[PDB]
């Protein structure tokens, strides 16, 4: 601290000290305390104001690393003196915000990355902040929106319909979109129709870019779909109008393309959930969601599914000169190998109809 | 298509005013234009994409007065002059069309010059200007050349855009036809 | 930078109603208030943006899609048929039609309204600073029924003030002008006074103009060896209008007229090359370059020099000419002239001495000798500043200043007069003020434009006295001017 502490306006000499101090402190509950209050309290202060010091960012992560962890720190030990010191760092903040627009807050925020778990001090600002920062144009949606939104987190959910309504379609623009992705953690939240109205963009803008979006997007389209689960329930008609409309999407998500894992967890979900543990009916209503497809190669899909299913592993357990030793291989050993050899082979091709004997056998038998 | 549909559609709804909406529009479809590219499919698929967004924006921002759309033609015109190099040729329809088009975009600066944008306007038109040029025209340019060489012949303007002050004065030189060349080298 | 200012009317129910009172609905009084500031920023012509919204009502205008609201307009510098567009709202026919046509009064909920208008602070796309809002209400009780609404007042309120966003309630006459003090804090949010009404607003802004401005920043080298940089400031310019703008006839639109030089003999052009900057006399025409002219200015550079120290009282008015506007010496950038400049003024004023300079205006000039009085620093308890600490930028007197003025004899008066004359003036004197002083006869035209602004019959046709009032002239003093008249003369005028 001493070494470092004492940096000042336009002092780049902080830069080392800070980078360290974070990295140092980054170790594990600085033992016997950091003495950041114990050798002297206002080591705090210096660090704080230092955070404020200038346009020059450097404090940020430093402070952040400090401050976010600082609470993550003070949990495992005496919590107190860390705490209000923040509140200082707030007033620091609240200034920075109010003093001038961009770099101030946005810093405060990427900072606030590690910060959160106490809130409105930033929030009800960032309330206007962020959207005004749609006013302030580009990467705020990132840096800002990001920050705020992981700020929102538990137990805000209410006006999201409003704060958030002020934007999202206000960008097509992209790599931020993690946010638009991320934002939805609401399992029992926005459940009435508002939510579906919010679902309107769901695959609207998720389509073309790196599907990295899709990943989590659909992934919670799961959570929520369970949250809609309508097994002869009727939480409402419109509820199921979602629940299906969801399903529209959902199985549109049964369509993997470049990532397999798409269809992987997509499927296994389909298994324990969208499916029973069954062959025969699963074959039946299998078809049910095939109708909406209007889209191809799916056949392979339904099949291969039931190829995994038709033997999970009742296959190899029930499998049916050295050339004289191939004699028994071509006399008696096992027929099981075929089973995947089939599917895998048969997964890739074009018109393969053996599917269809499986079908009719899967019924007419 | 999403290129084309999203462009003419969202850009079309934009005709009531767009602001960020259009621009990012122009951005994404424009910018994600080229980063998404393939021979055949995407190359000439664009060629029509570019083609008919030419036919679009000439109309669109031609109409559009200034407003948001000074900045919309930031987004575009930048994407334009940079999309010149996309096609060195197959330009001819868009050669001449963009010729008197961006001619009239000089004119759009002529409605309101300066501020921040209209700089960006004529400036982006300038690199729009030459890499465009294959020769391949005679008075389609030369006509333009004349009273461009008037429009810059004059007009106290910002320290910044002053490239245009000289911009075309030798670019008209690459236009070989004499008597305007006479005009300039007498004047210049 | 160009900021927010906000009109709002409260609604519970009876507010748009007159309380059955026989003058107006104080709602309407508010109406003309809105008129008054929005109009006001015609005159002041303020890049500040203005807000018109109501709530608490039957139907809605909003994007927040909730009961008991209306937007009226989004934040704006004004518009003529923005004015007119709002001009429907006077009159009982317009009271009602305004009401019902929009729907008038059902319910509301308070801090909901807070983030309503606040969320018109959402409306900011641009550079603003001042967050300033006004509620129009006589409401004595926001509600008694749900005190969770009250906790919501004391709750979001502090947020919105903490938002830097400030609404108060001017004393708009609920009876007594209000009778309520009690719980009221939440409802609301360089030495001056405050007022309860619009009239102050009305006239005060009738001529008013720009506020936040400091731009072109020069320097003063004190000696060759030591530094200050000098803030140029206009206490005013002798403020004038934004001047007549070119718009063509039926097209109504800006001409975008341009100008250059054709050849005025042959049909060709002309270029600054082709011409030059001349002086001509007698036989000889003499021609020298626009450059040659503009650099013949050159002596040093824009910037300033302590040229010395003079008795302040040395020159009062033997003289006067184009003012100091006020340069405040910058001290943030160059401080210690915090201290230096400080004790400078301290003791130079103490000396009754001043710092002469040679001021060199922007992109050079021929520079000129101009005194700088040290300007003292005047602040009261709440710090009225008449004398922002600084320098009087004191033009020196010169030949042209004295180029001519006559001298001849003078025949002189007698004390017989002054005995009366003094108190006569005591009747002619007034304690004057800083305020209500102008050349309105120019104001009257942005009245004449207030016309098209409202598109109405005759202007505000307001009142400042730049002209003397006869009842007082012939009143307080009387005709004793007669005594003076026949003192030494039977004039026949």
Swiss-Prot record, chain A:
The modification N6-acetyllysine is found at residue 3. The modification Phosphothreonine is found at residue 279. It is found in: Nucleus; Nucleus, Nucleolus; Cytoplasm, Cytosol. Autophosphorylated at two clusters, the T2609 cluster and the S2056 cluster. Autophosphorylation induces a conformational change that leads to remodeling of the DNA-PK complex, requisite for efficient end processing and DNA repair. S-nitrosylated by GAPDH. The modification Phosphoserine is found at residue 336. Serine/threonine-protein kinase that acts as a molecular sensor for DNA damage. Involved in DNA non-homologous end joining (NHEJ) required for double-strand break (DSB) repair and V(D)J recombination. Must be bound to DNA to express its catalytic properties. Promotes processing of hairpin DNA structures in V(D)J recombination by activation of the hairpin endonuclease artemis (DCLRE1C). Recruited by XRCC5 and XRCC6 to DNA ends and is required to (1) protect and align broken ends of DNA, thereby preventing their degradation, (2) and sequester the DSB for repair by NHEJ. DNA-PK is a heterotrimer of PRKDC and the Ku dimer (composed of XRCC6/Ku70 and XRCC5/Ku86). Formation of this complex may be promoted by interaction with ILF3. Component of the core long-range non-homologous end joining (NHEJ) complex (also named DNA-PK complex) composed of PRKDC, LIG4, XRCC4, XRCC6/Ku70, XRCC5/Ku86 and NHEJ1/XLF. Additional component of the NHEJ complex includes PAXX. Following autophosphorylation, PRKDC dissociates from DNA. Interacts with DNA-PKcs-interacting protein (KIP) with the region upstream the kinase domain. It is linked to Immunodeficiency 26 with or without neurologic abnormalities: A form of severe combined immunodeficiency characterized by reduced or absent T and B cells, recurrent candidiasis, and lower respiratory tract infections. Some patients show dysmorphic features, severe growth failure, microcephaly, seizures, and impaired neurological functions. Belongs to the PI3/PI4-kinase family. This is DNA-dependent protein kinase catalytic subunit. The chain holds residues 2257 to 2818 of 4128 of the full protein.
Curated annotation (Swiss-Prot), chain C:
Keywords: Acetylation, Activator, ADP-ribosylation, ATP-binding, Chromosome, Cytoplasm, DNA damage, DNA recombination, DNA repair, DNA-binding, Helicase, Host-virus interaction, Hydrolase, Immunity, Innate immunity, Isopeptide bond, Lyase, Methylation, Multifunctional enzyme, Nucleotide-binding, Nucleus, Phosphoprotein, Systemic lupus erythematosus, Transcription, Transcription regulation, Ubl conjugation. The modification N6-acetyllysine is found at residues 276, 290, 297, 420. It is found in: Nucleus; Chromosome; Cytoplasm. GO terms for biological process: activation of innate immune response; cellular hyperosmotic salinity response; cellular response to gamma radiation; cellular response to X-ray; double-strand break repair via classical nonhomologous end joining; double-strand break repair via nonhomologous end joining; innate immune response; negative regulation of DNA-templated transcription. Residues 236-300 are annotated as: DNA-binding. There is a cross-link at residues 246, 276 (Glycyl lysine isopeptide (Lys-Gly) (interchain with G-Cter in SUMO2)). Residues 332-441 are annotated as: Interaction with XRCC5. Changing residue 131 to A: Abolishes adduct formation. One of its GO terms (cellular component) is ficolin-1-rich granule lumen. The modification Phosphoserine is found at residues 18, 265, 436, 479. The modification Phosphothreonine is found at residue 414. Coiled coil: none annotated. Its EC number is 3.6.4.-, 4.2.99.-. The keyword Nucleotide-binding applies. GO terms for molecular function: 5'-deoxyribose-5-phosphate lyase activity; ATP binding; ATP hydrolysis activity; ATP-dependent activity, acting on DNA; cyclin binding; damaged DNA binding; DNA binding; DNA helicase activity. Forms a heterodimer with XRCC5/Ku80; heterodimerization stabilizes XRCC5 protein. Component of the core long-range non-homologous end joining (NHEJ) complex (also named DNA-PK complex) composed of PRKDC, LIG4, XRCC4, XRCC6/Ku70, XRCC5/Ku86 and NHEJ1/XLF. Additional component of the NHEJ complex includes PAXX. Following autophosphorylation, PRKDC dissociates from DNA, leading to formation of the short-range NHEJ complex, composed of LIG4, XRCC4, XRCC6/Ku70, XRCC5/Ku86 and NHEJ1/XLF. (Microbial infection) Interacts with human T-cell leukemia virus 1/HTLV-1 protein HBZ. Belongs to the ku70 family. Individuals with systemic lupus erythematosus (SLE) and related disorders produce extremely large amounts of autoantibodies to XRCC5 and XRCC6. Existence of a major autoantigenic epitope or epitopes on the C-terminal 190 amino acids of XRCC6 containing the leucine repeat. The majority of autoantibodies to XRCC6 in most sera from patients with SLE seem to be reactive with this region. This is X-ray repair cross-complementing protein 6. It comes from Homo sapiens.
């Amino acid at each position: 601290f001493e070494k470092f502490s004492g940096k000042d306006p336009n002092s780049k000499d902080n830069s080392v000290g800070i980078q360290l101090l974070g990295i140092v402190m980054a170790n594990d509950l600085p033992p016997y305390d950091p003495q950041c209050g114990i050798q002297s309290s206002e080591y705090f202060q210096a660090l704080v104001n230092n955070m404020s010091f200038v346009r020059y960012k450097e404090v940020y992560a430093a402070a952040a690393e400090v401050l976010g962890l600082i609470l993550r720190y003070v949990m495992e030990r005496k919590n107190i003196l860390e705490e209000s010191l923040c509140e200082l760092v707030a007033k620091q903040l609240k200034q920075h915000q109010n003093t001038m627009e961009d770099k101030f807050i946005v810093c405060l925020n990427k900072v606030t990355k590690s910060f959160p778990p106490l809130a409105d001090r930033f929030m009800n600002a960032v309330f206007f902040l962020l959207p005004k920062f749609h006013g302030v144009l580009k990467t705020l949606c990132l840096e800002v929106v990001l920050c705020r939104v992981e700020g929102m987190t538990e137990l805000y959910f209410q006006l999201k319909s409003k704060d958030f309504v002020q934007v999202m379609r206000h960008r097509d623009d992209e790599r931020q979109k993690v946010c638009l992705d991320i934002i939805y953690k609401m399992m029992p939240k926005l459940k009435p129709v508002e939510l579906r109205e919010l679902l309107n963009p769901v695959v609207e803008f998720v389509s073309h870019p790196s599907t990295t979006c899709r990943e989590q997007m659909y992934n919670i389209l799961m959570w929520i779909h369970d949250n809609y689960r309508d097994p002869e329930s009727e939480t409402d008609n419109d509820s199921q109008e979602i629940f299906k409309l969801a399903k529209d999407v959902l199985i549109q998500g049964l369509i993997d393309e470049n990532p397999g894992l798409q269809l992987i967890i997509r499927n296994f979900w389909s298994h324990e959930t969208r499916l029973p543990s069954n062959t025969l009916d699963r074959l039946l209503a299998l078809n049910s969601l095939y109708s909406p497809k209007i889209e191809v190669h799916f056949l392979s899909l339904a099949t291969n599914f039931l190829l995994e299913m038709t033997s999970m592993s009742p296959d190899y357990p029930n499998p049916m000169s050295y050339r004289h030793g191939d004699l028994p291989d071509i006399q008696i050993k096992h027929s099981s190998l075929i089973t995947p050899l089939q599917a895998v082979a048969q997964r890739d091709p074009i018109i393969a109809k053996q599917l269809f004997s499986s079908l009719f056998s899967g019924i007419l038998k | 298509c999403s290129l084309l549909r999203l462009q003419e559609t969202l850009s079309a709804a934009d005709r009531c005013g767009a602001a960020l909406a259009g621009h990012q529009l122009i951005r994404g479809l424009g910018q994600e234009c080229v980063l998404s590219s393939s021979p055949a499919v995407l190359a000439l698929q664009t060629s029509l994409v570019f083609s008919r967004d030419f036919g679009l924006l000439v109309f669109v921002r031609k109409s559009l007065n200034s407003i948001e759309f000074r900045e919309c033609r930031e987004e575009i015109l930048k994407f334009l002059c940079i999309f010149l190099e996309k096609m060195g040729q197959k330009i001819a329809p868009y050669s001449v069309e963009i010729k008197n088009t961006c001619t009239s975009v000089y004119t759009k600066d002529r409605a309101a010059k300066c501020k921040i944008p209209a700089l960006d306007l004529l400036i982006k038109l300038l690199q729009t200007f030459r890499s465009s040029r294959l020769m391949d025209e005679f008075k389609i340019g030369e006509l333009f050349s004349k009273f461009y060489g008037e429009l810059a012949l004059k007009k106290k303007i910002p320290d910044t855009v002053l490239e245009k002050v000289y911009e075309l004065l030798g670019l008209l030189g690459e236009v070989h036809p004499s008597e305007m060349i006479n005009n300039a080298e007498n004047l210049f | 930078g160009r900021d927010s200012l906000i009109f709002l009317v409260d609604a519970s129910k009876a507010m748009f109603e007159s309380q059955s009172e026989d003058e107006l609905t104080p709602f309407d009084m508010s109406i003309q208030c809105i008129q008054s500031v929005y109009i006001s920023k015609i005159i002041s012509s303020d890049r500040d943006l203005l807000a018109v919204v109501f709530y608490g009502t039957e139907k809605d205008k909003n994007s927040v899609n909730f009961k008991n609201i209306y937007v009226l307009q989004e934040l704006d510098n004004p518009g003529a048929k923005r004015i007119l567009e709002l001009d429907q709202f006077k009159g009982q026919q317009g009271q009602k039609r305004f009401q019902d046509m929009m729907g008038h009064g059902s319910d509301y909920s308070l801090s909901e309204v807070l983030w309503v208008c606040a969320n018109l602070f959402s409306d900011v796309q641009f550079k603003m600073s001042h967050k300033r809002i006004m509620l129009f209400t006589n409401e004595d009780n926001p509600h008694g029924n749900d005190s969770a609404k009250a906790s919501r007042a004391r709750t979001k309120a502090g947020d919105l003030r903490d938002t830097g966003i400030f609404l108060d309630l001017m004393h708009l006459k609920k009876p007594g002008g209000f009778d309520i003090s009690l719980f009221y804090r939440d409802i609301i949010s360089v030495h001056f006074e405050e007022s309860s009404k619009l009239e102050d607003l009305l006239r005060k802004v009738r001529a008013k103009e720009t506020r936040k401005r400091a731009l072109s920043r020069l320097k003063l080298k004190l000696n060759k060896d030591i530094v200050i940089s000098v803030g140029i400031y206009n206490l005013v310019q002798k403020a004038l209008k934004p001047p007549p703008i070119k718009l063509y006839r039926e097209t109504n639109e800006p001409v975008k007229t341009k100008t250059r030089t054709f050849n005025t003999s042959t049909g060709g052009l002309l270029l600054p090359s082709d011409t030059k900057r001349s002086q001509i006399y007698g036989s000889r025409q003499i021609i020298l370059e626009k450059e040659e002219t503009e650099e013949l200015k050159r002596f040093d550079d824009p910037g300033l020099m302590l040229m010395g120290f003079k008795p302040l009282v040395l020159l009062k008015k033997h003289h006067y000419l184009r003012p100091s506007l006020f340069v405040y010496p910058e001290e943030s950038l160059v401080i210690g002239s915090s201290t230096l400049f400080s004790a400078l003024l301290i003791k130079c004023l103490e000396k009754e001495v001043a710092a002469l300079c040679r001021y060199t205006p922007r992109r050079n000039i021929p520079p000129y000798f101009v005194a700088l009085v040290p300007q003292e620093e005047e602040l009261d308890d709440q710090k009225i500043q008449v004398t922002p600490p600084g320098f009087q930028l004191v033009f020196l007197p010169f030949a042209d200043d004295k180029r001519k003025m006559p001298f001849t004899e003078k025949i002189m008066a007698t004390p017989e007069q002054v005995g009366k004359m003094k108190a006569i003036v005591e009747k002619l004197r007034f304690t004057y003020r800083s305020d209500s002083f102008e050349n309105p006869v120019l104001q009257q035209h942005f009245r004449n434009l207030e016309a098209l602004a409202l598109d109405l019959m005759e202007p505000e046709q307001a009142v400042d006295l730049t002209l003397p009032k006869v009842e007082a002239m012939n009143k307080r003093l009387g005709s004793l001017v007669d005594e003076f008249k026949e003192l030494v003369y039977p004039p026949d005028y």
